[PDB]
Design a protein around this ligand. Structure first.
Ligand SMILES: [Zn+2]
Lengths: 84, 84
């Protein structure tokens, strides 16, 4: 089902540094609703800049330690048939 | 260097169909310039919708036969240090 695709870039050199997917949330788009982004209309449809208020809400799903002072972050909401 | 990330979905069902990276162009941003998308000033941003005019400009770098009448395409301009 739904997975969050997080990518980060260095603010200085601005090169693509890393990427990490969240666990599969299945058909529940609550995580997106909690971010203020409608589910059905925004999946597989572009990237969103990660703002400060999003950091703590997203952190529990990633091993990468999100630091918006050093990196620029983008999140895209990908959806595919269960079990990736 | 620069690599173009092409992802496409079925235009009817809306299901993911495939994804393919182009070769590494190094610091040659000519392909982006031909699309009318400033090289340095547009890498590592969101993704763009591929319009018909872009098809012949991109086709030489992908094995997949680009067909917009059947699929919907997105392209991202990813830039990382060399040797990826
Ligand atoms: Zn994107």
């Amino acid at each position: 089902g739904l997975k969050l695709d997080l990518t980060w870039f260095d603010k200085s050199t601005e090169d693509f540094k890393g990427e990490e997917y969240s666990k599969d949330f299945g058909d529940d788009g609550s995580v997106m609703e909690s971010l203020g982004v409608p589910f059905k209309d925004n999946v597989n449809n572009g990237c969103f800049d990660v703002i400060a208020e999003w950091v703590p809400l997203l952190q529990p799903y990633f091993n990468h330690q999100i630091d918006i002072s050093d990196n620029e972050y983008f999140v895209s909401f990908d959806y595919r048939d269960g079990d990736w």
